[PDB]
Design a protein around this ligand. Structure first.
Ligand SMILES: Cc1cc2nc3c(=O)[nH]c(=O)nc-3n(C[C@H](O)[C@H](O)[C@H](O)COP(=O)(O)OP(=O)(O)OC[C@H]3O[C@@H](n4cnc5c(N)ncnc54)[C@H](O)[C@@H]3O)c2cc1C
Length: 577
């Protein structure tokens, strides 16, 4: 693209929400759309990206920003990690995520009204949660009612294309779940989600569904990959965003201008950073790095909220995990790889996550004196999920998962199950994204502030106990567990579990909230129409606008944010739509 070029709409960051907004705005073939993106433009040519079973190998690949991130910062414990994975490619993090497609709980979204008004509640958002996807049930295994989750969009979704060898695994896990007295549930898309489910996935016919499917074959979209954003171009007198400045691989600085609006979609970590480099952020933070303050927006980079997870691995009887087929070299792997390279069939096309649990653990919490005190102190309401939403998302990954064992080696033998104990309703205060400098090529400093509140530790511990009770005592699956890896979970000692939760936890990969939607600038950074408070012609569309983190994996809500952003943009530009 030519330096100085004008487009109707400029999307900064071709990620999950960015391409959604851009692709929807290009549906008038006369509207010009530009996308600037730091990573490659051709993710559909990359086997590791398009192949679902390769997803975990994308950590630390060239497609991963590989941020350093402080996981917990308590007086008694602190840990910083690398990589905290985020997609650096067209499609953003939808090009390297673990595929689960689940909206969340109606009570949670209804509370967004405090920030976005009544249009950001469950009932009005349901269509936006479905518009991006086209639902498939080719083997006709599930209720026809579930067709409603696909509104016809360009992201193909389906129930997991089940691995045949894992059917005994699935049957015993189901038997064990029911034997614990917890429900089975298949419709988790109407606002309720209590039980164990067959998850849906951004996978179809063994291929990853990435947001890049929004912006291909559209001559009115100009895609400029391999450029790094330097700054938003702001006119102070007009209080107007004009466009964006980027740096190319050759080190040249380019200006691109929007004649209607700029949409910032750089994700939860780079969106607040780019805002701050451009003069929009906490004035004292800006001054400390030599950046002039155009708008004192105290919430930029604040309210960073993510789901903590404590994963654990069990060695399981032979044939009840996929390690021997996909993780280890040999004839079995060669065979399924040959099949996949010819027609994309076989378990190489699997995301390896097929059953997902959304329990409450009230009976576990009630055994802890400190939880009981805290609930009574909250007037008798559960501090985590007072409106009946889940406490956990339990991903039962049917294999050893390196992306969930950050400090342990891969076992050299045996089949495994990786359980991701993902606390979806934490009550710890949020962390923050802050500037390290005015350098656009340095990462922001990132603190997730997991487990600031001791109660979240108590919950995560009990979520681990629930999972252990399920797998070691639950019927059918109890006969499949061979050992714990890499050592025993110290569930018999609360004091050791305290250390175990802090030292073994990680991000469940759901960061949100750093430019959140709100009614005014004293509450957040963008307004209910996703416009940056104090700036004209600037919207934000990505996970950073999310004001209350959903009760589950978040990609479904992120697409919805993009879908709604595009609709509100179209409604304002009547002369083009
Ligand atoms: C490992 C992993 C697994 C996940 N698994 C799941 C799952 O199973 N289910 C689920 O629901 N969610 C999952 N997620 C979360 C989900 O993928 C993300 O929350 C979502 O994709 C975020 O979308 P976004 O548009 O806000 O940001 P992103 O998709 O990250 O888009 C940001 C884009 O901006 C670009 N960009 C950033 N900074 C710059 C810059 N300075 N210059 C130029 N371009 C820039 C990036 O390269 C990227 O393309 C996972 C996330 C990760 C990291």
């Amino acid at each position: 693209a030519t330096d100085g070029s004008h487009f109707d709409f400029v999307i900064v960051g071709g990620g999950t929400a960015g391409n959604t907004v851009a692709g929807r705005l290009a549906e008038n073939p006369n509207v010009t759309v530009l996308i600037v993106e730091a990573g490659i433009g051709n993710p559909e040519d990359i086997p590791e990206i398009t192949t679902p079973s390769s997803a975990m190998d994308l950590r630390n690949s060239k497609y991963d920003w590989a941020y350093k991130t402080t996981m917990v910062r308590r007086d008694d414990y602190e840990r910083i990690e690398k990589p905290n994975t985020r997609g650096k490619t067209l499609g953003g993090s939808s090009s390297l995520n673990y595929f689960t497609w689940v909206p969340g709980h109606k009570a949670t979204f209804d509370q967004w009204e405090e920030f976005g008004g009544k249009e950001w509640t469950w009932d009005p958002l349901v269509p936006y949660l479905r518009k991006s996807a086209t639902y498939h049930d080719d083997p006709r295994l599930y209720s026809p009612e579930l067709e409603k989750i696909g509104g016809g969009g360009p992201i193909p979704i389906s129930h997991a294309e089940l691995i045949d060898e894992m059917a005994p695994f699935r049957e015993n896990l189901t038997k064990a779940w029911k034997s614990m007295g917890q429900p089975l549930i298949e419709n988790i898309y109407d606002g309720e989600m209590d039980g164990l489910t067959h998850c849906c996935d951004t996978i179809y016919r063994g291929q990853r569904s990435g947001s890049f499917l929004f912006v291909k074959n559209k001559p009115n979209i100009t895609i400029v990959p391999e450029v790094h954003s330097k700054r938003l171009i702001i006119n102070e007198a007009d209080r107007t965003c004009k466009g964006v400045t980027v740096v190319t691989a050759a080190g040249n600085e380019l200006n691109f201008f929007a004649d209607r609006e700029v949409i910032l979609s750089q994700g939860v970590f780079e969106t607040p950073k780019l805002l701050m480099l451009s003069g929009i952020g906490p004035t004292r933070e800006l001054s400390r790095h030599g950046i002039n303050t155009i708008v004192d927006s105290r919430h930029v980079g604040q309210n960073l909220m993510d789901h903590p997870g404590v994963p654990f691995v069990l060695r399981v009887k032979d044939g009840f995990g996929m390690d021997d087929v996909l993780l280890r070299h040999g004839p079995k792997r060669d065979a399924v790889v040959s099949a996949y390279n010819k027609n994309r069939s076989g378990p190489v096309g699997s995301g390896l996550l097929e059953l997902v649990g959304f329990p409450r653990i009230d009976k576990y919490l009630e055994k802890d004196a400190e939880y009981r005190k805290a609930k009574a102190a909250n007037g008798g309401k559960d501090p985590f999920s007072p409106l009946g939403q889940p406490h956990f998302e339990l991903d039962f990954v049917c294999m050893f998962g390196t992306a969930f064992q950050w400090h342990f080696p891969t076992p050299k033998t045996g089949d495994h199950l990786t359980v991701v104990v993902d606390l979806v309703r934490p009550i710890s205060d949020p962390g923050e994204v802050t500037l390290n400098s005015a350098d656009p090529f340095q990462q922001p400093n990132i603190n997730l502030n997991f487990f600031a509140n001791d109660l979240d530790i108590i919950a995560m511990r009990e979520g681990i106990r629930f999972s252990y009770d399920l797998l070691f005592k639950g019927e059918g699956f109890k006969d499949l567990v061979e050992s714990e890896y890499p050592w025993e979970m110290p569930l018999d000692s609360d004091k050791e579990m305290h250390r175990a939760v802090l030292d073994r936890c990680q991000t469940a990969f759901h960061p949100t909230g750093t430019a959140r939607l709100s009614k005014n600038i004293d509450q957040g950074v963008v307004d209910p129409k996703l416009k940056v408070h104090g700036i004209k012609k600037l919207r934000v569309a990505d996970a950073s606008v999310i004001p209350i983190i959903p009760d589950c994996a978040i990609q479904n809500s992120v697409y919805a944010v993009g879908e709604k952003c595009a609709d509100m943009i179209k409604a304002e530009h009547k002369d083009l739509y």
